[PDB]
mmCIF file with all atom_site columns, N, CA and C in Angstrom:
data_model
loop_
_atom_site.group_PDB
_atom_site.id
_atom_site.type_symbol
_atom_site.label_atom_id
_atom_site.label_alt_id
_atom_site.label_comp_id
_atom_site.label_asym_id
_atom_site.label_entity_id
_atom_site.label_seq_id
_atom_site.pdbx_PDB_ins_code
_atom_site.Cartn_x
_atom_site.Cartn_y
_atom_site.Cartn_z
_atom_site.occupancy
_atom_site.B_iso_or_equiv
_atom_site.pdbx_formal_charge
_atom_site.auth_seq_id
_atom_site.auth_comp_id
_atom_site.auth_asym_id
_atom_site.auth_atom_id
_atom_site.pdbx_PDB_model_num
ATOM 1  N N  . UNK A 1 1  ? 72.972 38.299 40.539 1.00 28.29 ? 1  UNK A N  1
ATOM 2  C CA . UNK A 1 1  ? 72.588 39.739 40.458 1.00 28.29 ? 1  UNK A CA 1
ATOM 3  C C  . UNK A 1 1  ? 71.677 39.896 39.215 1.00 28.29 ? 1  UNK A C  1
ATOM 4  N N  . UNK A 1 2  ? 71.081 40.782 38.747 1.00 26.56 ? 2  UNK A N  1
ATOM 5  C CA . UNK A 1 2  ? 70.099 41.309 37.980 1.00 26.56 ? 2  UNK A CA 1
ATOM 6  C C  . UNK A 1 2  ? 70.448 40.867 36.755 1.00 26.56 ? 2  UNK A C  1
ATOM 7  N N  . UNK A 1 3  ? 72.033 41.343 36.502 1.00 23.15 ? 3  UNK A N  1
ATOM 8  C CA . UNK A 1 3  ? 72.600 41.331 34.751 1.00 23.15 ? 3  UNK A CA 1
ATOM 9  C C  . UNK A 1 3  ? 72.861 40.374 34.956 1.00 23.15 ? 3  UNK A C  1
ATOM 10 N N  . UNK A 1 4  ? 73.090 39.221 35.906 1.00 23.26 ? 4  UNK A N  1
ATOM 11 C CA . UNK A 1 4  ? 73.037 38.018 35.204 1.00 23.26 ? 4  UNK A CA 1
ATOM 12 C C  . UNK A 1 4  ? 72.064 37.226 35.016 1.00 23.26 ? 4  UNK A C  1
ATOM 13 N N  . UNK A 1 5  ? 70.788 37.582 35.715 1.00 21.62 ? 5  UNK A N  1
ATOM 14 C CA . UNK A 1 5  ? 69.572 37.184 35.210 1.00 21.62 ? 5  UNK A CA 1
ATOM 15 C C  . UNK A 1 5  ? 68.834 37.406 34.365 1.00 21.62 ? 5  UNK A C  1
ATOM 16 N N  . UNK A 1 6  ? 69.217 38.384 33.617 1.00 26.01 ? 6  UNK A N  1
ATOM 17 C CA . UNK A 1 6  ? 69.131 38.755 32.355 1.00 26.01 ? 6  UNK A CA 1
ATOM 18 C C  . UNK A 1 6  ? 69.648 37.991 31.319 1.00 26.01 ? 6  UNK A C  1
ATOM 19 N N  . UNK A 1 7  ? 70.829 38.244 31.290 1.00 23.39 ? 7  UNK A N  1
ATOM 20 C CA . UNK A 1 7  ? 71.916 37.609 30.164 1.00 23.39 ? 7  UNK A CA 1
ATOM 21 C C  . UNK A 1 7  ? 71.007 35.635 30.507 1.00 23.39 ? 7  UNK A C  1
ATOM 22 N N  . UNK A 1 8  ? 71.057 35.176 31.336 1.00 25.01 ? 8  UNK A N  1
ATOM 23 C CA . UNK A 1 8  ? 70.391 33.705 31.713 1.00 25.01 ? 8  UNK A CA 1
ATOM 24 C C  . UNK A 1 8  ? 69.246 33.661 30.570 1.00 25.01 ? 8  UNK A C  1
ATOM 25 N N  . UNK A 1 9  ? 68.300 34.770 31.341 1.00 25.26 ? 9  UNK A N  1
ATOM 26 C CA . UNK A 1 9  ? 67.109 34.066 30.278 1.00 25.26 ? 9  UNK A CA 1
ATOM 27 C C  . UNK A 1 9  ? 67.239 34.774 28.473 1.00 25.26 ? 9  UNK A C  1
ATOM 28 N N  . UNK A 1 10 ? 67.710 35.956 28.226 1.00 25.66 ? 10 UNK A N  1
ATOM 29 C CA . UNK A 1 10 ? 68.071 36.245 26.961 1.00 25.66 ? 10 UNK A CA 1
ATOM 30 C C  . UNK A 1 10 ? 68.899 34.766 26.207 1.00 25.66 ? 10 UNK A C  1
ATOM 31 N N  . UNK A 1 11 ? 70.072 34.649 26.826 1.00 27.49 ? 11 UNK A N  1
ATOM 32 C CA . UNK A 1 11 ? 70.670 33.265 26.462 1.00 27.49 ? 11 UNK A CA 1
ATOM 33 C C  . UNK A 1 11 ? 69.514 31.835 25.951 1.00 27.49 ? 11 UNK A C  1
ATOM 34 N N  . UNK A 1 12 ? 68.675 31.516 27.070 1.00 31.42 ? 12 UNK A N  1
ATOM 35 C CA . UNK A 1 12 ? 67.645 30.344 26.795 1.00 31.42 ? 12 UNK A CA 1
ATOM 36 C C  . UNK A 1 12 ? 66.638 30.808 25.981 1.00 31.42 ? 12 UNK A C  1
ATOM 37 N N  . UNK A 1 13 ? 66.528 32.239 25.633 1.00 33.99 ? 13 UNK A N  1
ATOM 38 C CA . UNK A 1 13 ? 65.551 32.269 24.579 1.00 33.99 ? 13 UNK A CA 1
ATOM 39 C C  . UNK A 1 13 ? 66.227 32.254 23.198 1.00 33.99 ? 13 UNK A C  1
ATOM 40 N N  . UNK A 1 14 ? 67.166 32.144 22.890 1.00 34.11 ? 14 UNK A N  1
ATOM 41 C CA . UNK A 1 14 ? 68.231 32.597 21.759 1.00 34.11 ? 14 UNK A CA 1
ATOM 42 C C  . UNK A 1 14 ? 68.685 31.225 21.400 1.00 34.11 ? 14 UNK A C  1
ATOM 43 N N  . UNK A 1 15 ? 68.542 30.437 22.502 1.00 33.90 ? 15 UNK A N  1
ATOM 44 C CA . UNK A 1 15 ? 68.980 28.414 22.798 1.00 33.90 ? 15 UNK A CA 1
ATOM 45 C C  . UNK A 1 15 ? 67.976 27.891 22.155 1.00 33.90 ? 15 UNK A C  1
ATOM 46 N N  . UNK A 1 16 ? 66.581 28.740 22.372 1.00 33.60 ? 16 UNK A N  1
ATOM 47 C CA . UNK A 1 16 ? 65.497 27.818 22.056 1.00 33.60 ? 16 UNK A CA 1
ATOM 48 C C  . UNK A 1 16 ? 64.991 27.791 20.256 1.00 33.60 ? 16 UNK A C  1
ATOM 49 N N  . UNK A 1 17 ? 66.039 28.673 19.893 1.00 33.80 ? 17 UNK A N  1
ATOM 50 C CA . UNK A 1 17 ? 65.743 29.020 18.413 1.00 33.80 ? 17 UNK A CA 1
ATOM 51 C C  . UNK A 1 17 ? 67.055 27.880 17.841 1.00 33.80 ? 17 UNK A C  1
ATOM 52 N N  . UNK A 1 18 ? 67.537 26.601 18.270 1.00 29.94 ? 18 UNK A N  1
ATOM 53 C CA . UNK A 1 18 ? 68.457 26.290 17.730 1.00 29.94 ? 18 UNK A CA 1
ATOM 54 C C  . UNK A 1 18 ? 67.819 24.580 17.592 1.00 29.94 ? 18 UNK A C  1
#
């Protein structure tokens, strides 16, 4: 659904700062 395609890519952009 939507909010979890959200939360997905918010998550891998927040991953990519590590």
């Amino acid at each position: 659904e939507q909010l979890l395609k959200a939360l997905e890519f918010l998550l891998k952009e927040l991953l990519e700062k590590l």
